[PDB]
């Protein structure tokens, strides 16, 4: 009928201050990786915070716009001739082509 | 603002609470980070009868680890919004018969040995005094509040009730 | 002059008390000279604080009130009040922003258990910056009244508790990350793992 | 004889941000479909709000009005002069012509 | 408790001299006594689940003029 | 307006309430949205035998 | 002060355990110089709120009982060298040995 | 001048007092003066704002 008490540890007293084994390298001078998130819907909105989180201008000039697919989630680059390489690889069925013009980007029909 | 508890509460005489805030919190639109993780909220209770298995703490101050003191009015509240904190109840029956059954066993071998083991029943008086002790032990006894106790480690929770207004703190 | 709200006013004292007119209302003090060299001190003395004014008049001859603060009067004294320096040695924008920023790590892993097969419950996207999990339903769009209440839970299957949330549009924030939310609308409920970083 | 809790959910934990192969295309440039909605009852009604919908006059020039029918129920056209020939189509039975002078809707009875 | 002071009474009624009245029986019954009273203060409680719909209905006007854009 | 409960109500010494609105409240004749979807109520309720 | 100085002596010998394995509990390090013991728990950097009741106890299986602390950050500084200290979030406790000085 | 109906108005306070006639209704000041030169400041303090 009394009161049960807080409860109480127990175990095999392992040691807190522990150095490890590998050394892991932590980088110092990170780059700017261009990739897909899910949060941007569609590819006009994925292209708009890839010019705007690398200081360049979006030309878009196709008539519509397209949604996201499965394989956009592979392209992981700090160099944004290669992503556009791997993007315009994803879109060729539906005639997208996306190039640098070496301050901006373009986004036109292919020939 | 979740906290965990430092101070074991129990409720006999009212006094005095400290829980140590958990989890950060932060601004009406989170734009500024106001208590800090690691701060300590201050309360204080009242004695009672606790009829309800709930404690009803009122908690008063905060104390940040970036050098603040605001004095907040926030009733404590359960892990799930209901009010009052949640207790063990203890109503102490193992007292309560222990020191009054003893002396009426006593008082009941005289009266056996009176009933039977003398003429005729013979009423025996070291029956009907000490039956006058366990009367006093059945009312002293019935005196005693009951207590519930909150352990050390709970996880409490605050309703603030009041706006705070950190504005004429925060850096610029 | 205006002094914290905080700490009540003992007393005051200015030399040359007929020379400036001064009322007070429990934390400030309207001066208003009346002659032209009541130059003097006032010493306010509070529980905590204690203040020495240096009064001056500066503008006495004027006709148009352009010429008074070309002169170099004050119309209002406030006074901020820093903490100590021991806890300065204990910024960069806002802390909430529901947009995806340039230097913040975000973790895309997230899960949802229902009974109900197309649920309008369901949330479109979960995500979080490490400080506050963005539940996102802007893609459930027919039911108008479509907006829960959202909880958390530190096991799969325990007692949930109260987190503090804060709403921009369709997007519910919920402040800190958490292992499992609980996200209920009345009978329905819809749970939400975060998965465990391999 | 205790209180019933709060529901607890339960099932198979599918995975939130998918995304899906099927790359849907939104149109960004959407112009206006000449259609028919059961809410203008008659012929008159429905032809006073094309005009207005796309600034052009309306000369109903019959003694009469007629109300919508089940075949009316199929134009969806964004040209004006192909729902006034699927119009005049479905009312030919009533001596009705419907017809566009370059700027204006012509409603008169059929040679 | 009132079950502890029945074992009391049963024991003394028979095993006992002649009815043999005891005194734990009596005395214990009044312990009994105070947990119907202490137990009798005790109010009923009423939940309402942290997931209901509730409904509010507003009693008087309250004028949103000075906020909208114009 | 329609909210839905976030805080557990337990009538024993009376405290504070919170619910989320769940649907949007327009004006008296719809021109103008004056509650949002998300928005939270606050209450209060007093303790009593609830009879 | 919660760095390291030039001319204090410090003692790195802590042992930690728990029933869990990978807690998000257990202290990342935990040090003294003396006169206050510098639990810091800045590596476990998952739950927001992660942020523990700290006590200390004379023996191992003994009573607990209150100490007086000071945080920094994320560093729980607790006033005084024990042998014992036990960390409390509810449920789930760790316990911290500070082993003998051979 | 008309404050907000919302806040309690505390005090009140122009320089010159004796050229301007001026009397209050819980959040409105009727200013009128009381001759050809008596320009001034006035500064109201209410429990959140300050003119």
């Not at chain 1, 990170?30 to 690398?54: F, I, V």
């Not at chain 1, 301050?103 to 029909?109: A, D, E, G, T, Y």
């Not at chain 2, 409720?11 to 829980?19: E, L, R, V």
Request: charged share 20%; proline share 6%; hydrophobic share 35%.
């Amino acid at each position: 009928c009394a009161t049960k008490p807080a409860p109480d540890f127990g175990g095999r007293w392992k040691h807190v201050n522990h150095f490890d084994e590998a050394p892991t390298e932590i980088p110092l001078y990170t780059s700017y990786t261009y990739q897909a998130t899910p949060m941007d819907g569609t590819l006009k909105t994925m292209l708009e915070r890839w010019a705007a989180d690398s200081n360049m201008q979006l030309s878009y000039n196709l008539p519509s716009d397209y949604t996201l697919i499965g394989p956009v989630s592979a392209i992981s680059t700090t160099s944004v001739q290669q992503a556009a390489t791997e993007l315009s690889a994803v879109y060729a069925a539906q005639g997208v082509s996306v190039s640098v013009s070496a301050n901006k980007l373009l986004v036109q029909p292919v020939p | 603002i979740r906290c965990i508890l430092e101070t074991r509460i129990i409720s006999d005489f009212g006094g005095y609470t400290s829980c140590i805030v958990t989890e950060p919190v932060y601004s009406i639109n989170g734009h500024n980070l106001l208590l800090p993780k690691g701060s300590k909220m201050l309360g204080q209770y009242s004695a009672g009868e606790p009829t309800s298995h709930r404690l009803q703490v009122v908690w008063d101050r905060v104390t940040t680890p970036t050098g603040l003191d605001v004095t907040l009015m926030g009733p404590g509240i359960d892990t799930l919004g209901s009010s009052g904190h949640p207790g063990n109840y203890n109503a102490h029956w193992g007292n309560k018969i222990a020191s009054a059954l003893f002396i009426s066993l006593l008082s009941d071998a005289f009266k056996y040995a009176a009933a039977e083991y003398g003429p005729e029943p013979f009423e025996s008086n070291t029956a009907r005094s000490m039956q006058q002790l366990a009367e006093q032990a059945v009312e002293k006894s019935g005196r005693r509040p009951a207590t519930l106790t909150i352990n050390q480690g709970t996880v409490l929770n605050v309703y603030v009730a009041k706006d705070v207004d950190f504005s004429a703190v925060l850096p610029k | 002059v205006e002094l914290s709200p905080n700490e009540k006013i003992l007393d005051y004292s200015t030399g040359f008390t007929g020379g400036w007119e001064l009322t007070r209302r429990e934390n400030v003090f309207y001066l208003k000279p009346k002659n032209v060299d009541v130059d003097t001190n006032m010493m306010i003395r509070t529980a905590t604080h204690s203040y020495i004014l240096e009064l001056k008049v500066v503008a006495t001859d004027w006709q148009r009130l352009e010429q008074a603060k070309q002169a170099g009067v004050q119309y209002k004294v406030v006074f901020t009040y820093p903490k100590d320096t021991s806890f300065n040695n204990v910024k960069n924008g806002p802390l909430l922003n529901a947009k995806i920023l340039k230097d913040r790590r975000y973790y895309y892993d997230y899960d949802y258990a229902t009974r109900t097969k197309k649920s309008w419950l369901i949330p479109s996207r979960v995500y979080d910056d490490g400080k506050f999990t963005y539940i996102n339903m802007d893609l459930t769009r027919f039911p108008t009244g479509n907006f829960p209440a959202v909880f958390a839970r530190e096991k799969e299957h325990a007692e949930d508790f109260l987190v503090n949330t804060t709403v921009e549009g369709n997007t519910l924030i919920v402040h800190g990350t958490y292992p499992f939310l609980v996200v209920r609308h009345g009978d329905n409920v819809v749970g939400l793992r975060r998965n465990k970083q391999k």
